[PDB]
A paper describes a structure:
The spliceosome produces mRNA by excising introns from pre-mRNAs in two sequential phosphoryl transfer reactions—branching and exon ligation. Following assembly of the spliceosome (Wilkinson et al., 2020), branching occurs in the B∗ complex when the 2′-hydroxyl of the brA attacks the 5′-SS. The resulting C complex is remodeled by the DEAH-box ATPase Prp16 into the C∗ open conformation. Docking of the 3′-splice site (3′-SS) at the active site (Fica et al., 2017; Wilkinson et al., 2017) forms the closed C∗ complex, which then catalyzes exon ligation, when the 3′-hydroxyl of the 5′-exon attacks the 3′-SS, resulting in mRNA formation and excision of the lariat-intron.
Here, we present the electron cryomicroscopy reconstruction of the Saccharomyces cerevisiae C-complex spliceosome at 2.8 Å resolution and identify a novel C-complex intermediate (Ci) that elucidates the molecular basis for this equilibrium. We merged all C-complex particles obtained by cryo-EM from various spliceosome purifications and investigated binding of Slu7 and Prp18 by focused classification. This yielded a cryo-EM reconstruction at 2.8 Å resolution for the C-complex core, showing complete base separation and base and side-chain rotamers and allowing discrimination between adenosine and guanosine bases. In our 2.8-Å C-complex map, we observed a new spherical density clearly separated from adjacent phosphates and bases in a position corresponding to K1 in group II introns. As our spliceosomes were purified using buffers containing K+, we assigned this density as a K+ ion. This ion interacts with 3 of the 4 U6 snRNA residues that provide ligands for the catalytic Mg2+ ions, including the ligands for M2 (A59, G60, and U80), as well as with the third triplex strand (G52), and is thus ideally positioned to stabilize M1 and M2 binding in the active site, as does K1 in group II introns. The density unambiguously demonstrates that brA pairs to the sugar edge of U(+68) in a base-triple interaction, while the 5′-SS U(+2) pairs with U2 snRNA G37 in the context of another base triple, as we proposed previously (Galej et al., 2016). Using focused classification, we identified a subset of particles in the C-complex conformation with extra density on the same face of Prp8RH that Prp18 binds in C∗. The α-helical domain of Prp18 visible in C∗ was a perfect fit for this density, which also accommodated a small peptide of Slu7 (termed the EIE element) that is known to bind Prp18 (James et al., 2002). The conserved loop of Prp18 that stabilizes the 3′-SS docked in the active site in C∗/P is not visible in this subset of particles (Prp18CR; Wilkinson et al., 2017), suggesting it is disordered before Prp16 remodeling and 3′-SS docking. We also observed density corresponding to the Zn knuckle of Slu7 (ZnK) bound to Prp8 in this new intermediate.
Author numbering:
A (entry chain g): 5 to 76
B (entry chain C): 865 to 912
C (entry chain C): 97 to 516, 533 to 672
D (entry chain f): 12 to 86
E (entry chain e): 10 to 62, 69 to 92
F (entry chain b): 3 to 64, 72 to 102
G (entry chain A): 291 to 338
H (entry chain h): 1 to 106
Amino acid sequence: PELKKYMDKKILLNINGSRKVAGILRGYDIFLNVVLDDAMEINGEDPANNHQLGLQTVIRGNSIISLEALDA
Amino acid sequence: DITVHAPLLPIVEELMKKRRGSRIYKTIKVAGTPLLEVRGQVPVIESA
Amino acid sequence: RTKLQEHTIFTQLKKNIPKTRYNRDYMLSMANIPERIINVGVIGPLHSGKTSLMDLLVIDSHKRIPDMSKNVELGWKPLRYLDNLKQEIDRGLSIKLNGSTLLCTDLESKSRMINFLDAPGHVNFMDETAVALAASDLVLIVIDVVEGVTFVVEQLIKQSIKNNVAMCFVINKLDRLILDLKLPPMDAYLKLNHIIANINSFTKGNVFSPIDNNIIFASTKLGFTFTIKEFVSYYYAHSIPSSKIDDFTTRLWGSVYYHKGNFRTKPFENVEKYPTFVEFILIPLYKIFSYALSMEKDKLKNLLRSNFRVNLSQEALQYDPQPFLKHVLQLIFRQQTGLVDAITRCYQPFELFDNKTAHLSIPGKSTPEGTLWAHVLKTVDYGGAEWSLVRIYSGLLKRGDTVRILDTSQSESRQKRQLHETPSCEVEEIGLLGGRYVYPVHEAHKGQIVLIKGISSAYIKSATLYSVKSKEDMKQLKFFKPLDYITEAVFKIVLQPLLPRELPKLLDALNKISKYYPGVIIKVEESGEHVILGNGELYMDCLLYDLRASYAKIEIKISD
Amino acid sequence: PVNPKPFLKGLVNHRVGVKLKFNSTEYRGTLVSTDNYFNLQLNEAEEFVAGVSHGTLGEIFIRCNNVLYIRELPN
Amino acid sequence: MVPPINCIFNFLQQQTPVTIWLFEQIGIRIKGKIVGFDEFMNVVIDEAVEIPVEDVEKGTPLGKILLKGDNITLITS
Amino acid sequence: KIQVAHSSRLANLIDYKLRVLTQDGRVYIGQLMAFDKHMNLVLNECIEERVPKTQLDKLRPRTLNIKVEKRVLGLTILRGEQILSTVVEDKPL
Amino acid sequence: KKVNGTSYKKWSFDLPEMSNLYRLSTPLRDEVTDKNYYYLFDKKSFFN
Amino acid sequence: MKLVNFLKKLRNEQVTIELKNGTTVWGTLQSVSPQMNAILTDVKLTLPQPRLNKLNSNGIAMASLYLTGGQQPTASDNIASLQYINIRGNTIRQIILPDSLNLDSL
Amino acid sequence: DFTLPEDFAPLLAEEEELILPNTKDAMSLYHSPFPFNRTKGKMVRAQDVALAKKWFLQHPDEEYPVKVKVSYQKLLKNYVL
Amino acid sequence: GIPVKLLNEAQGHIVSLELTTGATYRGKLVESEDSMNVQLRDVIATEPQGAVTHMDQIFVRGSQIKFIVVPDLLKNAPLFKK
Amino acid sequence: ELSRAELEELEEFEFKHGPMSLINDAMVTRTPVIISLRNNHKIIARVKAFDRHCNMVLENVKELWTEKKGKNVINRERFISKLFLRGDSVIVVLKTP
RNA sequence: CAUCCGGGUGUUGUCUCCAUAGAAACAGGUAAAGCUGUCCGUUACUGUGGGCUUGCCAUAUUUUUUGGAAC
Ligand SMILES: Nc1nc2c(ncn2[C@@H]2O[C@H](COP(=O)(O)OP(=O)(O)OP(=O)(O)O)[C@@H](O)[C@H]2O)c(=O)[nH]1
Ligand SMILES: [Mg+2]
């Protein structure tokens, strides 16, 4: 699970459904369960339609499709 | 750096006395072998 | 016909360049990818077996080598492939830097192009070792069990740490514990522990041990190398559940003891035990040696079939003791893939390439890939002509391209001018380093080491090779430093032609000596005599032989 | 701090409700047995679809992969 | 570095209220407190309420539930 | 048309031209180079063929021709999880 | 099995035989195994 | 434990299989693997026409059935016939067994 | 803690002994010069076995008198030529 | 086995992914795992709708990959030998 | 973890005490179960065996399922004699009175 | 620069000792011989039995084989 290169960057994250979320990655495991920070549901046009989710958020790994390091 | 069988160290130190300015500083007992590693110095003009 | 027997064994005919077992075009096809090239410097003390280690890697790469006699196939004599100068063949000694480019494969079946450079082991040829360190990403430090970590090994470790290269250690000549010193296996394990502990004493922070596969055990006379990971992969992984393999691997070193499926960190009470490495690794090796030398052949082949799944042919069973021992060990230890896996796992570019480049150049930001940028490490006499050994650090180089060459002795002032003019050359021919041949190519890419035939007149000892497309590229250009040859030349000879008529021939030859021998200093007195400085007496013997026999080919008087 | 398998072990002989992943279906019934894979056996069950009580049933076995959640009903 | 399961435990011990997202079933999220956690990320939720996808007004209470790990997309603060 | 022996296993079909179905109703056609525990497949000189929705309705029950689309792919690894069924099209030539 | 045939051209022994012949050969066999013994007392040094 | 080894007994029977996608597969059973991967010969594939006519669900199944390479022009109800097929074990829903089999022995 | 099957054992553990009775002789033969490091070969002519040659290729015993020493030296001369 | 080894022997080349969701990605394979997770760089991307974009670097979970396209050169790589 | 023989006896214990014992009672009693399948088909059959995965060899099968033609909705009623059934397709088993 | 005492390998012939199932029945042909053809023994689909070059033997609970399906 070679996520180390991303482990404190801002990551956008495709998830089951079609519902992008995004946040600063904070940790991962052998299943790709991910924990991430400043978490935002990226529903659409940002100034009203997205939603900030909370101080902590964690994903069950099977639900991730793919992820992108928008801040490299 | 000199590698020699241990019972022949007298010959090596005699040679280091015959050459001018040469000195031996340390002897390493090479573990598990009959060898010694003998560390020293000799001037380059004396090294021929 | 041009003939080269007077100077070197070398393949002049392309039809006789040996056939690789792998497809060679496939190796070129991955030269475009920097992540697939590793440059390996095989360094180590005198007579450590470095050329023999290379002989292993060469033989396993090729189908048939024309220079193989039956004495070498059967293992009576070493091949000594990279020691191909006549002078090296006669002295029994690596004198000059040689190498090969080989497609190599790890225990996971992934392939790399590996460039190996085989540094001379004799202490007075440390200039070549410095060139090897400059060129290499990783270094195999070969040491033999008997003398172990000597002061020469200490300085090689220190220079490797200075040069920002990944160290990996080959503990060679394990047969000399078994056959020469005749140690019982527990004492041999203690010997290996003393060696590995001494290695760790000088590698400042980094830890070396076999379970980390930074240690390789070898006997390049008897044709084998292995790592713990390699041995458990071949002969224990099939007999335990697959989830257990790495944890079983982790326990095959140190103060670990075993009994009937259970492990301890102390010996068992009711039966006296050796450690896990002795039980599972070293005693089987000792038993292979003993039984191959002294067991009845039919019982031996039954044992080998039951244990190692290796069949012995009828012709192999007729072999003499040392060829038979080599044959059995080579059947057991399988083509050096655990050495390639150690090389693969020990080097990470992310931590080292920036530091290496910042050591050999000034520190700064990365080179833009639109520019060609390369380090011309030395001039080499190779076959019927001289070449330049070059590492391409960025960009691409094409055959026939017009390229600019700056000698490293001008780098400091030019760089100061950057912060507040260069000759140019055509790259006539490009060829991969192949030991006893040069394999021509049309391209060379980032991370690759290759020979180049045109640029050799624009510098003496080393150079920066570059090509640019914008003046802003020139403003961002970095120049490689003059290279740190590890030993300073202090052994002096005064030199004069026998007949003064022949002075110009000597001038040409001395230019050639200064080019080919990196560490030699040549200067001319106001007396009209020539002064050569070298590392020591063998070094001077070698270069004076070159003067008399190949380059000046005149009679030369010399002082004491 | 009750863990999931101890919780279901505690719920035995209680009247639970189980909503499935499919067909908007919920079964309500007395929990009889449970295993390591969280398969369920229920007794005197009733089928609810979208909250409409279709009919009562005898013994029931619900396969583990079909359930969304399990809950204790008021008792 | 915080391991994900240790973050789930840091929801558990602090007894903090959280909202959970279902797997493929888009139209619901569930709010409550994490009472239990698991090796397979099954969770026991107390004072649980399912809420549509928008807010607490339209939700309906579930009581104490065990929510099987196969359906958890997110856990959120 | 091809016929293959009742000797059952996929291991005998190396270098045969398979046509391989997937859960999404395309078919991949290529020479089998290797196979795996999970039935991951490697197909050389591979072609994906696919029925667009424009003529998917011509398969409804009533001399017949379907203008299926075809796509070139290079040395595909197919994820076994997606593979629906496998049929043999040609022997090694 | 020890000799090719009565033309008496090739031979092949076992370890017990070669050990016995080596042991008998003690007067007339060479016993200088150390190759460094011949330093400056070998063919090519005599040539030089 | 036992029931994949039950299927392994059934070699050379003219078994009949319904895949999860709904297509029905008649054929001669050559092998069943321990992962339930089944090999058939002298095989006929079919989709039943009361199911088939709803395009929205059955488009995938129909497209797969045609692209086998064995669908002749529709004499009736989208039949295909091929000499050999390998079927992934996960894809099976039902296997209709031969009427003459003595299950009580197994 | 970690464990492995109870019948798991190292390679060549069925053969109890490391040193066979002939191993000492095999080790002695391995290091010997030619022909004793071999176990097969070609027949040579009897006149081609140079029995005395190995003596004068080596340094004589230092106590020997002058006639013996010059004999050694002259035989070396013949060999070199 | 060979297919995972081929995906490792593909690292450093340009590969094309297609996913279960119907997206397609084409780019240089930086790293791949035995689980078929992959990382791509300088990635051309395509939506299920057929809309096209570009992105710097991506990671993909193995389970969601439908197939991977590999450069034709690799048919003669040493992986396939007996 | 546990030894092979212990796992064998554990499987027997699970079949008798666990939730699967509803199917076991019907199998031993030779009385027909009702099984709602994943594709909304309902099998009615007599069980002859089952395993850990809830696969089950069935005999005496009847198989109800329903179809719709526009506004109309209709039932289909296939009969089968001997049938293997892959366990993943099972929603919920009943035991009839 | 030669001579002499010797040596390796390959092919063909010859000599010595020791052998036999068979369709060694018949035709074409080369620097040679199945070099080539008609032909003969049995085996390609199973029941008892040896070996391995494989799989179960090691997997229902997130990355493949025990269905987020069904509409
Ligand atoms: N006993 C034993 N001898 C070896 C082994 N490996 C090499 N040798 C011998 O060691 C001597 C040196 O061989 P090389 O291969 O040239 O060693 P090197 O490291 O290249 O030494 P340099 O020429 O100075 O570079 C030779 O006589 C070899 O036959 C070994 O594993 N065991
Ligand atoms: Mg050397």
